[PDB]
Symmetry: D2
Subunit: 198 residues, 4 copies
């Protein structure tokens, strides 16, 4: 049974960059629904798989990827943020960023561009390409998870679904992106990065 993880901080801990109403709804409503729906979906799948019902298994893919991806993305997202975030990463992560994107500011502009560029619902990601052994930026549609659909290891994710910012930033997604850089938990991003150094 997958479960809803607690936030590492309070709902208003990220004010004024992301207000508490958004954090409260995003976590307790959106994330909560994905976990429960994901559990329901896996259950149906085990039955379909047990019976060898290929048609059912295929019909259940949209729900599994959507709710499963919803669970994966937000679980990472919460840890990607922090009341004491912002600033810049250090050591290896920072050097990697400089190496792969020219500079930290150029990196931010690129991830921002990818996130702002998403048409409809989706996510912007800073991931690690194990095969090439370098950082890479990618955008994912709807709730599709990064690793499961591209193979890249997620390091930092920027949720650009409208529910992630509309109450506060309305249609101006760029304002949301500008603000979120202030709460990025580079300590966590660094840990995820070092995890791929093994």
């Amino acid at each position: 049974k997958h479960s809803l993880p607690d936030l590492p901080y309070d709902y208003g801990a990220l004010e004024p960059h992301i207000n508490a109403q958004i954090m409260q709804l995003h976590h307790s409503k959106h994330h909560a629904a994905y976990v429960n729906n994901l559990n329901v979906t896996e259950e149906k799948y085990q039955e379909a798989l047990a019976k060898g019902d290929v048609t059912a298994q295929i019909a259940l893919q949209p729900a599994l990827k959507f709710n499963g991806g919803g669970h994966i993305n937000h679980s990472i997202f919460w840890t990607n943020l922090s009341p004491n975030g912002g600033g810049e990463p250090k050591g290896e992560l920072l050097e990697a960023i400089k190496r792969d994107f020219g500079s930290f500011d150029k990196f931010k502009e690129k991830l921002t561009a990818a996130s702002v560029g998403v048409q409809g619902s989706g996510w912007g990601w800073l991931g690690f390409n194990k095969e090439r052994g370098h950082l890479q930026i990618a955008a994912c549609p709807n709730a599709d998870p990064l690793q499961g659909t591209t193979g890249l290891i997620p390091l930092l994710g920027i949720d650009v679904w409208e529910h992630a910012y509309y109450l506060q930033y309305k249609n101006v997604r760029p304002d949301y992106l500008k603000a979120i850089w202030n709460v990025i938990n580079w300590e966590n991003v660094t840990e995820r990065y070092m995890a791929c150094k093994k």
Copy 2:
């Protein structure tokens, strides 16, 4: 030059089913952007087409479908709503609905189901199938327009992008759907339906 059409009513004309803040932003911000971006896109396309640059034409498809679809959908959407909407359609349209969906209430449940079922951004539609000569319900992803991607003639569209209801209904999309039935302009839907009787 395509242009932003005026609303057939005031921004607060649909209260309390869809508040004025949503109508104001949806029209003056979201729709406005699509028109302007659509004009910019067509311009680039004419240049690419004139030069026979197939690569550019293909690279411009996402922007053209997205902004073009955005313009088409909202233009129809505004006319699909009315302060004096609600109730049920009559004559041929109503009979068609009964014939194709059992009853008007069954129809509403089906269009509601399709709209609520959209994962991510999108639209729910009541369209007309010219080939089969009957009504049909379809859901479209992101800003993809109904006729351009399915061939069906749009009659009634229900926007389920989060910007269409989040400020007022938050994550509870079903509340938004319940409410919108009160402002549906069946006079306009009927006119669009009769237009296919030719």
Copy 3:
């Protein structure tokens, strides 16, 4: 465990409409491969599901749908064909056709055009819409199965992947479509129809 079914006739039984080489290859190589890969993917999914590994389950989706769909489609396809086939169906099925498509010839035209219209690999299908209670034609990309992705019940399928006709008809897919009508097992299509119209 899924298994490759025996063909219900000799590899050269559909001559000269679909030659023996194609039939033998199509069955012993193409269908056989889908079965083996299907069984491999399902086993991996069983492990992923047991571990609650959502990322793995999602990554396995393309292979599960491709091979599973391949198995589903070809299994139906073989029964849809017969050496003593051809001609036209009778009774209710024929009535439903003329009713839903105008006439048999118009039906042939519609299905043929859907099949010839497939860009890349895919299938054309005559299915049954249990919701609307009527026949419906649809086309599916690559190996995507009809029911698992559209909800329609498969009645008659026409494989338009190039391996299904290239050796004999080369690039002329229309000649292939014209020929196949001579071996359609209308008795089997009738069974499938009456089976879901209970």
Copy 4:
């Protein structure tokens, strides 16, 4: 007006790696058809664009991308092959390869696996990422062109549609991939590389 280019060699010049029948069919039938349909679609788009008919422009997208992409891909493909080809590239290109893929053999392995991995119709490509300033391998579905959909500059393409190898290698796509390495025109791949690495 787009035109079908002449092959830079005899139809049987790539024997026995890719036989004459395939070459002649591939060029005079498949590529020729893409050109004609491309010219038809573009003209229709010119009319739609002139009328500000967004619905028509969007409906024409599938045909424009399919035939336009078909033209782009095959035009490049012919130049990528040569009767006196094979072996390994030299200078900077060879340096970039060993650098971005470990070695030439690892590169062959990577491109081969990407090409053999295509489910349905598609292409495997060795391209150049101008943004990252390095080589990159990618696979495109159906006739979708590399640059128009990924932004990568095409250097070497491997057509894995079944019409590109079925007559000779049947279902064994890997044998086809192994053989094609003998006719790769590394001189042309080098030109494309140096052309975008200015």
